Motif scaffolding. Structure first.
Motif, PDB file in Angstrom:
ATOM      1  N   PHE A   1       0.882  -1.085  -0.082  1.00 16.57           N
ATOM      2  CA  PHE A   1      -0.143   0.089  -0.011  1.00 16.57           C
ATOM      3  C   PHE A   1       0.897   1.033   0.024  1.00 16.57           C
ATOM      4  CE2 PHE A   1      -2.164  -2.972   2.748  1.00 16.57           C
ATOM      5  CZ  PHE A   1      -3.128  -3.674   1.794  1.00 16.57           C
TER       6      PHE A   1
ATOM      7  N   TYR B   1     -17.659   6.555 -18.751  1.00 11.77           N
ATOM      8  CA  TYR B   1     -17.218   5.649 -17.732  1.00 11.77           C
ATOM      9  C   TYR B   1     -15.721   6.070 -17.321  1.00 11.77           C
ATOM     10  CZ  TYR B   1     -17.124   1.247 -15.167  1.00 11.77           C
ATOM     11  OH  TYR B   1     -17.108   0.266 -14.229  1.00 11.77           O
TER      12      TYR B   1
ATOM     13  N   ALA C   1     -12.327   6.512 -14.975  1.00  6.55           N
ATOM     14  CA  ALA C   1     -11.696   6.510 -13.494  1.00  6.55           C
ATOM     15  C   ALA C   1     -11.752   7.706 -13.039  1.00  6.55           C
ATOM     16  CB  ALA C   1     -10.521   5.802 -13.828  1.00  6.55           C
TER      17      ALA C   1
ATOM     18  N   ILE D   1      -4.226   6.098 -15.422  1.00  5.85           N
ATOM     19  CA  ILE D   1      -4.261   7.418 -14.580  1.00  5.85           C
ATOM     20  C   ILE D   1      -3.980   7.159 -13.001  1.00  5.85           C
ATOM     21  CG2 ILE D   1      -5.791   8.620 -16.066  1.00  5.85           C
ATOM     22  CD1 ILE D   1      -8.020   8.357 -14.457  1.00  5.85           C
ATOM     23  N   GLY D   2      -3.054   8.025 -12.309  1.00  5.70           N
ATOM     24  CA  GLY D   2      -3.115   7.712 -10.905  1.00  5.70           C
ATOM     25  C   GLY D   2      -3.689   8.587  -9.903  1.00  5.70           C
ATOM     26  N   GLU D   3      -4.628   9.605 -10.515  1.00  7.19           N
ATOM     27  CA  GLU D   3      -5.651  10.500  -9.644  1.00  7.19           C
ATOM     28  C   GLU D   3      -6.773   9.567  -9.002  1.00  7.19           C
ATOM     29  OE1 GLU D   3      -4.704  11.119 -12.747  1.00  7.19           O
ATOM     30  OE2 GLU D   3      -3.405  13.025 -12.716  1.00  7.19           O
ATOM     31  N   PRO D   4      -7.132   9.879  -8.025  1.00  9.28           N
ATOM     32  CA  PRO D   4      -8.212   9.259  -7.251  1.00  9.28           C
ATOM     33  C   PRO D   4      -9.410   8.600  -8.186  1.00  9.28           C
ATOM     34  CG  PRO D   4      -8.050  11.286  -6.108  1.00  9.28           C
ATOM     35  CD  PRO D   4      -7.103  11.230  -7.511  1.00  9.28           C
ATOM     36  N   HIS D   5      -9.234   7.209  -7.965  1.00  9.95           N
ATOM     37  CA  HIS D   5     -10.260   6.126  -8.799  1.00  9.95           C
ATOM     38  C   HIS D   5     -10.923   5.471  -7.809  1.00  9.95           C
ATOM     39  CE1 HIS D   5     -11.556   3.725 -11.723  1.00  9.95           C
ATOM     40  NE2 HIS D   5     -10.892   2.723 -11.558  1.00  9.95           N
ATOM     41  N   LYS D   6     -12.277   5.036  -8.208  1.00  6.03           N
ATOM     42  CA  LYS D   6     -12.909   4.168  -7.607  1.00  6.03           C
ATOM     43  C   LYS D   6     -13.424   4.573  -6.244  1.00  6.03           C
ATOM     44  CE  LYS D   6     -14.121   0.334  -9.667  1.00  6.03           C
ATOM     45  NZ  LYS D   6     -13.733   0.295 -11.154  1.00  6.03           N
TER      46      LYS D   6
ATOM     47  N   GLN E   1     -16.044   1.469  -4.848  1.00  2.45           N
ATOM     48  CA  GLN E   1     -15.719   0.307  -5.442  1.00  2.45           C
ATOM     49  C   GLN E   1     -16.728  -0.579  -6.118  1.00  2.45           C
ATOM     50  OE1 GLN E   1     -13.981  -1.584  -7.019  1.00  2.45           O
ATOM     51  NE2 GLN E   1     -12.380  -2.132  -5.688  1.00  2.45           N
TER      52      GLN E   1
ATOM     53  N   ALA F   1     -21.224  -3.626 -13.189  1.00  2.00           N
ATOM     54  CA  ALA F   1     -20.850  -3.303 -14.625  1.00  2.00           C
ATOM     55  C   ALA F   1     -21.900  -4.006 -15.486  1.00  2.00           C
ATOM     56  CB  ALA F   1     -19.535  -3.731 -14.769  1.00  2.00           C
ATOM     57  N   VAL F   2     -22.688  -4.795 -15.206  1.00  2.00           N
ATOM     58  CA  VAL F   2     -23.528  -5.655 -16.185  1.00  2.00           C
ATOM     59  C   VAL F   2     -24.664  -4.487 -16.664  1.00  2.00           C
ATOM     60  CG1 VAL F   2     -25.113  -6.169 -14.208  1.00  2.00           C
ATOM     61  CG2 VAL F   2     -25.259  -7.322 -16.244  1.00  2.00           C
TER      62      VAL F   2
END
Ligand SMILES: CC(=O)N[C@@H]1[C@@H](O)[C@H](O)[C@@H](CO)O[C@H]1O
Ligand SMILES: *[C@@H]1O[C@H](CO)[C@@H](O)[C@H](O)[C@H]1NC(C)=O
Lengths: 103, 438
Positions: free
Chosen positions: B257, B308, B310, B388-393, B396, B401-402
Motif C-alpha cells: 500500500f 465511464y 476512472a 491515470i494515478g488520480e483518485p479512482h473508484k 468500489q 458493470a452488467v
C-alpha cells in the motif's frame, strides 16, 4: 537505455526512478463494453477484464439450456408415447386432433 | 445530533453524507481523511557497527616464566608462547639462550566512526493507528486527530468524535527490525547475548557508549614466527560490512500500500488500507429548520453526457421550480456515484449543472436537490485514456458493470421449460385417465 514493459496493477502502481520524488499511476478499463443497439460481441470486453467470472457464465448458460432442452425432449417424447397409450388398434383414431399433436 | 458512517482508509477521498431530522433541512457532511499515522510500540534491544581489534603492546618475560590472565574486555583473547625470538631496530630486546617467553593478548572495541554508523536492532509490537479527519458541515470546517481506537474521542472545540476500530489489522512492520542511517530493514536479528562470527549483529551493546560489552568473533593468536617482535592475529571478517554488502532492498521498496515510513518515530504514514466506522456528533444549533430553507418544486434531471472514466468526468444537469431565494444542498443516495459540490444557489425557475463520478457504466440512480429526490438514468462509455494515478473508484465496484441490455438479453435467454414440463405432465395424466376409460 532501453525499453521496459510493466503490467500495472489494477488498483495502482509505484514509480521510483532517479533521486527525485516518485509518482503513482493507476489503471482502468477501455474495452468496448456497452452495445450500440445492434448485436455485438460484448463478451470480449468482459474477457479483457476479470478473465475469471466471465467464462463461467457461458458454461452455466450452456448447461442450463442443454438441461432444459433435454428435459423438454424427454418429456414430450414420453407424453407422445403415453398419448399413444391409445394402442387401441380396434377403434379408429380416438381423435385425429390428438394425432396432429402426436404428428 | 449523532450520525454513524463507514469510510475507506485512503487519503484525498472526500466522502459526503446527509443527516435526516424531521423539520430540519438535510445537512451536507463532508469527511476527509487527511493522512494516516501508524505508530507501533517498540523496545531498544542493542546496537551494532563496524569494530576494531585491539593490538596492545605484548608482555615479555626474559629468561623466566609467566602465566596468562583473562580480561573483562569483550571478546578477549590471551595466550603465552615460549622460545620467543625477540628482535627490534634496537636489536635483541633482552638476552638469554632462547629461554625467554612472551604473553600476547587482544580484544575488540567499536571504532569512532561507529558513533554515527551505529545500527540499532528493534523489537516492535502492538501497532497503533492515528487518523486525522477534517469535517465540513454547514460551510463550516472543523478538524480532529484521533487514535483509531473506538474508545478515545478526541478534542476539537471540545467536541467528542470517535473512529474505528479497523475492519482488519495491517502492519508492514515485523517483530524484528533494524534501523541504520535512516533506513529500516526487516530482518530477524540474533537475540542479545548470542554471538555468531560472520553474521549480523556480531558486536552487541546495551548503549552506544556502554563500557560493558559482550562479543565473540573467533580470534585466534598465532605464534611468533619472525625476527622482530610481532603479534599475528587471525579473525573472521566483520559481520557489519557483511550484512551491509547483501542486506537486500530496503523496506521502502517492499511496504504494501505504499506506506511512507519515517524513522525518528519508527512509524508509517500516508498508507491506505481497510475501512473505518465513525460516529460524528454535531451541535443542534448547526442545524437549520426547514421553515427558513428554500422551497423547490417540479425538479427534473438530465444527463447531458457521461463517460465511464476512472477520474471525475461525469456531468449532469437539473432544472427546478421554486419560490424562495437562497442555497440548498445536493446529494446522491446511490453509493455507485459521488457528486463534487454539496450545495448551490436556488432561483424561482433556474437550472444548474453538476459534476460527478461513477464506478459503473449504467448511470442510473436517485439524486436529491435540496430536500426533494428525483430519479435519473443514462449510460456511460469507457474512456480513450486508460492509465491515470488520480483518485479512482471513490466507490468500489459492486458487480454492477452488467448493463441493462445485458439483463434484457439474459432474461430473453433463460427459458421457461418448467412450465412446459408441468403442462406436459398435466396433459399426460389427463390422457392416462381418458384411456383408463377405455
Ligand atoms: C628452543 C625452541 O625453539 N624450542 C621449541 C620446543 O619448545 C618445542 O617443543 C618444539 C616443537 O616444535 O620446537 C622447538
Ligand atoms: C452557509 O450556507 C447558508 C445557507 O444559505 C448561508 O446562509 C450561510 O451564509 C453560509 N455560510 C457561509 C460562511 O458562507
Amino acid at each position: 537505455t532501453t525499453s521496459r514493459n510493466f503490467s500495472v496493477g489494477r488498483e495502482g502502481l509505484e514509480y521510483v526512478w532517479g533521486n527525485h520524488e516518485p509518482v503513482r499511476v493507476w489503471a482502468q478499463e477501455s474495452a468496448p463494453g456497452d452495445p450500440h443497439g445492434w448485436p455485438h460481441e460484448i463478451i470480449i470486453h468482459y474477457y479483457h477484464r476479470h478473465p475469471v467470472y466471465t467464462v463461467i457464465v457461458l458454461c452455466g448458460v450452456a448447461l442450463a439450456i442443454l438441461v432444459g432442452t433435454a428435459s423438454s425432449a424427454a418429456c414430450i417424447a414420453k407424453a407422445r408415447r403415453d398419448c399413444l397409450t391409445p394402442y387401441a388398434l380396434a377403434p379408429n383414431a380416438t381423435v385425429p386432433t390428438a394425432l396432429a399433436v402426436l404428428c | 445530533f449523532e450520525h454513524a458512517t463507514t469510510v475507506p482508509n485512503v487519503p484525498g477521498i472526500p466522502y459526503k453524507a446527509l443527516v435526516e431530522r424531521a423539520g430540519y433541512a438535510p445537512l451536507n457532511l463532508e469527511i476527509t481523511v487527511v493522512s494516516s499515522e501508524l505508530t507501533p510500540s517498540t523496545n531498544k534491544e542493542y546496537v551494532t557497527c563496524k569494530f576494531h581489534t585491539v593490538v596492545p603492546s605484548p608482555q615479555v618475560k626474559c629468561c623466566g616464566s609467566l602465566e596468562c590472565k583473562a580480561s573483562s574486555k569483550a571478546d578477549y583473547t590471551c595466550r603465552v608462547f615460549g622460545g620467543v625470538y625477540p628482535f627490534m631496530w634496537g636489536g635483541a630486546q633482552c638476552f638469554c639462550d632462547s629461554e625467554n617467553t612472551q604473553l600476547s593478548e587482544a580484544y575488540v572495541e567499536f571504532a569512532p566512526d561507529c558513533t554515527i554508523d551505529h545500527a540499532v536492532a528493534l523489537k516492535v509490537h502492538t501497532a497503533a493507528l492515528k487518523v486525522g479527519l477534517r469535517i465540513v458541515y454547514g460551510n463550516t470546517t472543523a478538524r480532529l486527530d484521533t487514535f483509531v481506537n473506538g474508545v478515545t474521542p478526541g478534542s476539537s472545540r471540545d467536541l467528542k468524535v470517535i473512529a474505528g476500530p479497523i475492519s482488519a489489522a495491517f502492519s508492514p512492520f515485523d517483530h524484528k527490525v533494524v534501523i541504520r542511517k535512516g533506513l529500516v530493514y526487516n530482518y530477524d536479528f540474533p537475540e542479545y547475548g548470542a554471538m555468531n562470527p560472520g553474521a549480523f549483529g556480531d558486536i552487541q551493546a546495551s548503549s552506544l557508549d556502554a563500557t560493558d560489552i559482550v562479543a565473540r568473533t573467533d580470534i585466534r593468536l598465532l605464534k611468533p614466527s619472525v625476527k622482530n617482535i610481532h603479534v599475528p592475529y587471525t579473525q573472521a571478517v566483520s559481520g557489519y560490512e557483511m550484512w551491509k554488502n547483501n542486506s537486500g532492498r530496503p523496506l521502502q521498496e517492499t511496504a504494501p500500500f505504499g506506506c511512507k515510513i519515517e524513522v525518528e518515530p519508527l512509524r508509517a504514514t500516508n498508507c491506505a488500507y481497510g475501512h473505518i466506522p465513525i460516529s460524528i456528533d454535531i451541535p443542534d444549533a448547526a442545524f437549520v429548520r426547514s421553515s427558513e430553507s428554500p422551497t423547490i418544486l417540479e425538479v427534473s434531471c438530465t444527463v447531458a453526457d457521461c463517460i465511464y472514466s476512472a477520474d471525475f468526468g461525469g456531468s449532469l444537469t437539473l432544472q427546478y421550480k421554486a419560490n424562495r431565494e437562497g442555497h440548498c444542498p445536493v446529494h446522491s443516495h446511490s453509493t455507485t456515484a459521488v457528486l463534487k459540490e454539496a450545495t448551490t444557489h436556488v432561483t424561482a425557475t433556474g437550472s444548474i449543472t453538476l459534476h460527478f463520478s461513477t464506478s459503473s457504466p449504467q448511470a442510473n440512480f436517485i439524486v436529491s436537490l435540496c430536500g426533494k429526490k428525483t430519479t435519473c438514468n443514462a449510460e456511460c462509455k469507457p474512456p480513450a485514456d486508460h492509465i491515470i494515478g488520480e483518485p479512482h473508484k471513490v466507490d468500489q465496484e459492486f458487480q454492477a458493470a452488467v448493463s441493462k441490455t445485458s439483463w434484457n438479453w439474459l432474461l430473453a435467454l433463460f427459458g421457461g421449460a418448467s412450465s412446459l414440463i408441468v403442462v406436459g405432465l398435466i396433459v399426460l395424466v389427463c390422457s392416462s385417465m381418458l384411456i383408463n376409460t377405455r
